[PDB]
Design a protein around this ligand. Structure first.
Ligand SMILES: Nc1ncnc2c1ncn2[C@@H]1O[C@H](COP(=O)(O)OP(=O)(O)OP(=O)(O)O)[C@@H](O)[C@H]1O
Lengths: 210, 429, 447
């Protein structure tokens, strides 16, 4: 998952509207270039490399018509559907999710609502209450960020692979002036952008900025 | 008296075996809750459970019939072939409440042609069993539920001899349970419908302990009464269930039926006392079921002792290290004790338990690729923690074989990064 | 003319893989479709020329698949045993999926036999009891294949395919004709007591030291030595007054009664297969390089993990040309099998699947916990053991006080110390957590 800056909208979208046409009728290649421009060759939220190009609508097409064809909601995802986490699980395995409850990663920062433990789990951010706290669990349940044993085993296996990295970096703190150490941490957080589960490795090498 | 202080634990404490089936002298302590024996595939552990079953058979014989002479040892098999003693003793101590904290027993057998008739000393166990029988006859009292379950329970699948109390002890020991008797008894209960609550208890028992099964009933079709379950949402008969599913259902249902007849006065007849031996609790089970067998067993039978053998790390990962009893790989040098594992097992990694408790590496050594990652480590440390042609080739091999997200590749990347930072800081320092 | 063409078509001759003969015209099950077949409402499966392992969680039909494959191989077995012979049929009371409007079951397997005849689309079907219309079985091509085999064999000795089904019951407690190798082939095979009886018999037959019985015994003994952890096997009669079997289990020289029960079951299976394959491959330098289809339900039954981690290291190396269809519960055996040779079910499946696909994650050479975490969806730690969660809660406590120790976190650390021990890896983790969070707090304080 990474921030994206959307750019010039494809004209083909202006040619297709809900009721007049369906998503299937659109030429995917007519929209693929623009996508490649904003997210490069990396998946938007669920963060594969795009060896398997996949176009997704963040909001489901079924419940949310009209906005299906609009440029804003077209992103990348884990891969071509032709599983139990990331995108698919919301409509199949989840229950009666109420839309706005869930956290949408393109206006609100996920860190303000949930953090990543070194055990590979994800829990609501400390100090959350009320509806702010409600958004935290419900993003875990609907996206099944924990219940999917494949996800828990990959997030955990990723952080645990670099936990000694956090040990050696931090233990050298006193031996080097602050300006030099912060540079080491800067390179450390630079590479996790190009690795799976960046937020999981972000909260293991620093905090969520509570 | 409160039914003679019976209605106080009731369990086994110790088992000594002297010149009995390769056991020159072996004393085993047993936990009131759950003991698990490991190390052998079930040769010496079968001997241990067989000796415990022989001991329990006397309790059964005397609770059933007055003066009943339970199973005796055999002059032909249950005596170490090479023993200057020329007799075999199977001694065992029991603990039954605050009063009678030590009920001893010995089953002795001497070869033919020995001067003294080395004789079993079963008087105190017989006395306790006679107390059970007499106080039960005077007033109904819940009684122990002894059972045995060996690898023979993996077997394909009369109102007088199935519905009358004390039928719970029939073939209770000796191995495979009487699941056919349970089937007939359950059909009879369904025909009758106290029987209602018994039916409900058995239903909840095998619905909760068995993951796949979610319901059980019988269709009373005219001319053929069938027992049906809901396996994975499919309404099937018992003949349709898989080997592991039906084998475990038979084990749990036989046990539950025995406890329901033996414990009529409990609010939950599954919480009655007993000593259940189970060879290879993991039989026909998959890792996911292994990781919950003992939790479910202990949940549905709150107050009962389990002596169960096993060879699965997932099973041990759910049991405290105190409960485990390790046979040494060099048992040929007969040992007098079974020490618990040094490492804690409950709540631990299955991989760690497998590596240390059982001496089984996390990755097989027969596969060359299995060693690759480890080799890489050494190679990195050979070239001053820096890449060379060999380590680069090994990294490429790991990346190609295991994949790009491969845990092995991630750990290789971490190793190279750590070593490069080592060298960089060494230069800086 | 025609007969010689057929004989050359069956007696395939090609040996260039380091002396390992391979058939130019290989018989093997290429596909298998199940329709209303006891849970499976519709299910396709593909197979490999060498090995295919089906995994599941006790309710995902794995012995059903082997049962169906055996009930379709029974027709080949029957029609190689006398013309017009009948094969095994589907049950009309159990083997049809109970939830079906069709009320009939179909097993449309298909076999590839050589470059010329690339398809043998046989099909075995049965309708439910009470259905007026009755489904037939498209067995004719199976009859044609078995008939050509039998006829060419009668006119000239022919290496026949070796079909075997080693199901679970091969562990439950329970002569010179070639076709005796087909006896109980698809059920009741691989019993240990049968094996010891047969091979004391074979040792007695060649005791004088003057298909030869000696060749058969030597070949099966080599199979035992090469695909089992034990390294030697003999019969000791001419000592002790009885006939006992002796092995070299772990470098010892013991009796087979001292062997682990799982090792005994695997030994019986291996010996049975070797005997059958040396009976059905008379014209062959190494009879173990013969063709056929062998099914093994729960190949790791009663085997200690240390034995599971070596079972399949030698199945293919000693039986190159036979299609193995195995099912298993253990990941430890999977740590020796490629993902190419694995098919898995999906937990939370009502049975209306469409195909079983290989694991995306390479299982060969991988950690048993990782290939148990992803392939089989089993956590390295029991979710029911509260202790396993302790470390996780520890993190929360630290983060609840700006990553610094306090009363509650210290109490939980004491609990971890008391339970897991001082050399516990969980304790090393907890110490790392404490240090990291403490000096993270210290960075936050100084900036
Ligand atoms: N006629 C049927 N109708 C509906 N469902 C059925 C029918 N027959 C079997 N099933 C289902 O098949 C399941 C058993 O299939 P199977 O025994 O092959 O599972 P398995 O564990 O993989 O096999 P095994 O452990 O013996 O190797 C039953 O639990 C049941 O859910």
């Amino acid at each position: 998952m990474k921030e994206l800056a959307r750019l010039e909208s494809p004209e083909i979208l202006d040619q297709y509207t809900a009721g007049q046409n369906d998503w299937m009728e659109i030429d995917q290649s007519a929209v693929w270039p623009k996508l490649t421009e904003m997210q490069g060759e990396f998946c938007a939220y669920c963060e594969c490399r795009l060896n398997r190009r996949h176009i997704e609508h963040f909001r489901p097409r079924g419940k949310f018509p009209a906005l299906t064809f609009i440029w804003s909601n077209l992103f990348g995802s884990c891969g071509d559907s032709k599983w139990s986490r990331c995108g698919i699980y919301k409509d199949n395995g989840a229950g009666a999710y109420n839309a706005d409850d869930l956290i949408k990663p393109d206006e609100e920062n996920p860190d303000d609502y949930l953090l990543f433990l070194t055990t590979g789990e994800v829990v609501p951010a400390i100090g959350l209450t009320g509806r702010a706290l409600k958004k935290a669990q419900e993003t875990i349940r609907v996206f099944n960020l924990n219940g999917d044993i494949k996800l828990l085993g990959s997030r955990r296996t990723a952080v645990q692979a670099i936990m000694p990295n956090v040990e050696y970096l931090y233990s050298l703190l006193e031996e080097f002036e602050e300006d030099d150490w912060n540079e080491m941490l800067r390179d450390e957080l630079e590479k996790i952008e190009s690795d799976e589960f960046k937020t999981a490795l972000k909260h293991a090498w620093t905090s969520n900025q509570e | 008296t409160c039914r003679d202080y019976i209605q106080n634990a009731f369990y086994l404490r110790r088992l000594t075996l002297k010149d009995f089936r390769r056991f020159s002298l072996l004393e085993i302590k047993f936990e009131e809750d759950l003991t698990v024996i490991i190390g052998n595939n079930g040769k010496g552990k079968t001997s241990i459970l067989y000796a415990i079953a022989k001991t329990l058979s006397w309790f059964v014989a005397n609770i059933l019939k007055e003066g009943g002479s339970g199973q005796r040892l055999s002059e032909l098999t249950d005596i170490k072939n090479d023993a200057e003693n020329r007799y075999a003793d199977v001694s065992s101590t029991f603990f039954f409440g605050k009063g009678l904290k030590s009920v001893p027993i010995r089953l002795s057998r001497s070869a033919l042609g020995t001067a003294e008739r080395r004789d079993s000393e079963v008087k105190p166990a017989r006395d306790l069993a006679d107390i059970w029988r007499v106080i039960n006859e005077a007033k109904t009292i819940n009684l122990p539920t002894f059972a045995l379950y060996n690898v023979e329970r993996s077997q394909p699948f009369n109102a007088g001899r199935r519905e009358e109390r004390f039928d719970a002890y029939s073939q209770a020991l000796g191995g495979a349970g009487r699941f056919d008797h349970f089937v007939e008894w359950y059909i009879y209960l369904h025909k009758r419908t106290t029987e209602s609550v018994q039916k409900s208890i058995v239903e909840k028992s095998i619905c909760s302990v068995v993951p796949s099964i979610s319901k059980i009933w019988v269709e009373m079709t005219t001319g053929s009464d069938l027992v049906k379950v809901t396996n994975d949402g499919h309404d099937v008969t018992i003949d349709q269930l898989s080997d592991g599913q039906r084998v475990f259902l038979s084990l749990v249902a036989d046990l539950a039926r025995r406890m329901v007849m033996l414990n009529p006065l409990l609010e939950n007849p599954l919480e009655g006392r007993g000593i259940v031996l189970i060879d290879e609790i993991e039989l026909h089970l998959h890792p996911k079921w292994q990781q919950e067998v003992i939790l479910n067993l202990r949940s549905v039978f709150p107050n009962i002792q389990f002596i169960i053998t096993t060879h699965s790390p997932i099973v041990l990962s759910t049991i405290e290290k105190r409960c485990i009893r390790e046979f040494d790989p060099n048992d040929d040098g007969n040992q007098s004790f079974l020490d618990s594992p040094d490492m804690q097992t409950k709540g631990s990694e299955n991989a760690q338990i497998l590596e240390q408790v059982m001496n089984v590496h996390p990755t097989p050594p027969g596969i060359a690729e299995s060693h690759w990652l480890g080799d890489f480590e050494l190679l990195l440390l050979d070239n001053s923690g820096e890449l060379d042609n060999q380590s680069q080739e090994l990294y490429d091999k790991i990346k190609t074989h295991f994949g790009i997200d491969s845990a092995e590749l991630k750990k290789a990347d971490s190793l190279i990064r750590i070593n490069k930072m080592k060298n960089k800081i060494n230069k800086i320092r």
